[PDB]
Design a protein around this ligand. Structure first.
Ligand SMILES: Cc1cc2nc3c(=O)[nH]c(=O)nc-3n(C[C@H](O)[C@H](O)[C@H](O)COP(=O)(O)O)c2cc1C
Ligand SMILES: Cc1cc2nc3c(=O)[nH]c(=O)nc-3n(C[C@H](O)[C@H](O)[C@H](O)COP(=O)(O)O)c2cc1C
Ligand SMILES: CCCCCCCCC(=O)CCCCCCCCC(=O)O
Ligand SMILES: CCCCCCCCC(=O)CCCCCCCCC(=O)O
Ligand SMILES: [Cl-]
Ligand SMILES: [Cl-]
Ligand SMILES: [Cl-]
Ligand SMILES: [Cl-]
Ligand SMILES: [Cl-]
Lengths: 217, 210
């Protein structure tokens, strides 16, 4: 069908966004390949981010063993989503994303896409704020980036014909180590559970019973 | 919707900072765009966002007192700016709103009790910082949807947080014990190439004297 290859099988914006609902029970018989998961994550990461630092990090949970480990830091209220989802994409904030600030915006200049003067405005203005920032503010900054990419991922999920639930009902003191992520670096934000919505039970047919009946003579 | 192509809207979205200052957006349409954006999810459906629409020279002058000067091109040229602040008292109606979902027949009493017993204590016993974090997340997802809604409507937009975080909420006239500032959404039509005007054929305006 046409709207793929825009690679979006539901490319109707109004339907995708305005008929979006949190789905918490998915069809456990449908699995999403990791290649399509990577595709959806890349599509979501077209999202904006402060100073284009893209301060998000994704951890994909899609095996029974990964789920059992993941659930250690997830509130039991949210076990239905985790158990039934094809995959959970957990989003953590990168509070060291500004370490590459100067190099990154220099690359834009070296590519001839901004003037030297423009580059100097960008470096002069925002880099010192990142460099002198408190932990709380870096966490705040990273949390915003993670939320806008999470929002896009919820839409991307539907554009691929799936559905999804965003959730932050987690153990915030345990999630980062549970994911094996650098606690110095990463802050937990939200999980995105993804899969096919749980459907209505199949209504089966019957042969006409006259076919399976004899009257004895 | 002018542009209902999701791939185009989302994947061809760019931050636009220089808008056409002759183009204005009616407050009626601004309201419709905000409503469309607030279809966004929010934790416990508390919808902990608050919008302050800035669209007059007087309002812009007030607003800029808490905006970094780097972001003046956006604020000055935009048709409107929608600033999004987080409501850290959003959980005050927690019990009431989720009771209502129960009374209207859409959750079981057992389900309501699970919901109330699990998350309501977390909000009521939350640190200021946790309520701030919670409302920031809500504010950011509706902010992301508003960026997309602007393009669906044929406009363009820029999200920005280069502001004075201490001055902004009182600059908006909001209660700083209740509201936390998150980001602005400048909305407008992107600047377009200058008009290439025509000329009369100059022979029409020329005489050769006899
Ligand atoms: C930050 C955030 C955290 C959320 N956490 C949970 C969660 O822990 N468990 C859950 O079942 N739903 C969670 N949700 C889903 C919301 O309850 C849901 O978005 C809201 O009730 C509105 O319903 P809708 O998404 O279907 O429009 C979360 C949503 C957001 C934005
Ligand atoms: C949280 C946040 C704050 C931002 N603040 C500003 C800002 O203060 N000034 C500005 O010009 N752009 C701001 N931006 C826009 C980013 O610089 C832009 O998203 C990024 O460079 C990626 O470019 P794109 O939006 O064109 O995809 C902000 C974006 C985000 C997500
Ligand atoms: C410590 C962080 C404080 C708030 C940060 C807000 C983000 C600031 C930005 O994203 C502005 C980055 C500059 C964008 C690049 C300029 C565009 C180039 C051009 O249009 O000529
Ligand atoms: C860990 C501390 C913060 C957690 C807050 C996360 C928000 C929690 C939620 O949004 C869940 C609210 C209840 C939703 C219930 C929806 C109806 C359930 C059903 O379909 O039966
Ligand atoms: Cl098609
Ligand atoms: Cl695949
Ligand atoms: Cl628990
Ligand atoms: Cl410098
Ligand atoms: Cl300044």
């Amino acid at each position: 069908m046409s709207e793929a290859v825009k690679n979006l099988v539901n490319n109707d914006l109004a339907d995708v966004m305005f008929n979006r609902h949190s789905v918490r029970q998915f069809d456990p018989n449908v699995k999403i390949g990791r290649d399509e998961l990577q595709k959806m994550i890349a599509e979501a990461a077209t999202a904006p981010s402060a100073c284009n630092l893209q301060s998000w990090h994704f951890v994909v949970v899609d095996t029974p063993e990964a789920k059992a480990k993941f659930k250690q830091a997830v509130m039991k209220f949210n076990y239905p989503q985790v158990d039934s989802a094809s995959a959970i994409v957990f989003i953590a904030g990168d509070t060291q994303s500004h370490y590459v600030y100067r190099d990154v915006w220099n690359k834009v200049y070296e590519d001839g896409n901004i003037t030297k003067e423009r580059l100097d405005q960008i470096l002069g203005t925002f880099l010192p704020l990142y460099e002198n920032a408190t932990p709380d503010f870096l966490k705040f900054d990273a949390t915003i980036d993670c939320s806008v990419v999470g929002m896009q991922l919820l839409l991307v999920a539907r554009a691929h014909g799936y559905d999804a639930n965003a959730f932050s009902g987690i153990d915030f003191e345990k999630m980062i180590p549970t994911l094996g992520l650098d606690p110095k670096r990463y802050v937990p934000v939200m999980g995105i559970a993804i899969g096919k919505a749980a459907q209505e039970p199949l209504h089966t047919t019957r042969y006409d019973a006259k076919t399976q009946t004899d009257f004895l003579a």
